[PDB]
Amino acid sequence: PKIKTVRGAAKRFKKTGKGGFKHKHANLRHILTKKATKRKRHLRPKAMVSKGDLGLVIACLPYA
């Protein structure tokens, strides 16, 4: 039967123009006041999935 998607992965990843995946950075969720503003700013924008974990993401998201 149809392959099922890993719904968590679906929530966390979105495919881009060539077939990458952007994702939201970790560590910008709670205790923030100790984190430096520069660090927070850098974490804020989205980020492409690296070469190492691309395969795993692909496995997770067969219909992405």
Partner: protein, 144 residues
């Protein structure tokens, strides 16, 4: 051309791996699974995104955003699709009849993609700046 003279193209059919048929085969005793582990086992292996136990990437990283229901009912049209309709008026109904947009599509946009040669009248559709310019150049008309 008889039923015993036809033959496939070279490279069309390839040999099907048969595991575990002796030494010369190549895929001998073990069948390309190495020596006794979990992956070696029949039914063996670990589910998608399993990292030995490490919090897997699809969990490490935070969830984000929401899904728009209006996006499911929006659509994007091409100037080649402005020519693919019949007549000289591009409504939603006309586009749907043409089979360009989907049936449950309340909204559509004409984007500068491809090119429009014939004059067309885009009625009740959003049109991008490039597309509007292109249609006007073609000799078209846009109205709300």
């Amino acid at each position: 051309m008889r039923l015993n003279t036809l033959s496939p193209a070279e490279g069309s059919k390839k040999a099907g791996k048969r595991l575990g048929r002796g030494i010369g085969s190549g895929l001998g005793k073990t069948g390309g699974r190495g020596h006794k582990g979990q992956k070696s086992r029949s039914g063996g292996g670990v589910r998608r995104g399993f990292e030995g136990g490490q919090m897997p990437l699809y969990r490490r990283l935070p969830k984000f955003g929401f899904t728009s229901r209006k996006a499911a009912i929006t659509a994007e049209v091409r100037l080649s699709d402005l020519a693919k309709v019949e007549g000289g008026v591009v409504d939603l109904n006309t586009l749907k009849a043409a089979n360009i947009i989907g049936i449950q599509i309340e909204f559509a946009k004409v984007i500068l993609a491809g090119e429009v040669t014939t004059p067309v009248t885009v009625r009740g559709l959003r049109v991008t700046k490039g597309a509007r310019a292109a249609i006007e150049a073609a000799g078209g008309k846009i109205e709300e």
